């Protein structure tokens, strides 16, 4: 058995063919067991609405999830992804840095 805990990036992405939207993106990567739970947060509270989830493996045990959606983001309020895994005792908050 292997387990290995999943990498958390939190970063926004304009399309290039749309300028004027703008995605939060939280890629998970490299986790095992693909057993996982992600969401976005706005002010600690879930968004309901994430129009797109891609899962991926490379090796039979390693696992990648890009988890995102459409968003206008304001300088009023904290964006966050929380992750769920077996490897993590608590629910871990990575908060977007807007720099990304």
Request: net charge negative.
């Amino acid at each position: 058995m292997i387990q290995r805990t999943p990498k958390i990036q939190v970063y926004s992405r304009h399309p290039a063919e749309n300028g004027k939207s703008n995605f939060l993106n939280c890629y998970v990567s490299g986790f095992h067991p693909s057993d996982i739970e992600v969401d976005l947060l706005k002010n600690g509270e879930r968004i309901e609405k994430v129009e797109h989830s891609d899962l991926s493996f490379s090796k039979d045990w390693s696992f990648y999830l890009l988890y995102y959606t459409e968003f206008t983001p304001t300088e009023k309020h904290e964006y966050a992804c929380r992750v769920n895994h077996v490897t993590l005792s608590q629910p871990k908050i990575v908060k977007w840095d807007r720099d990304m």
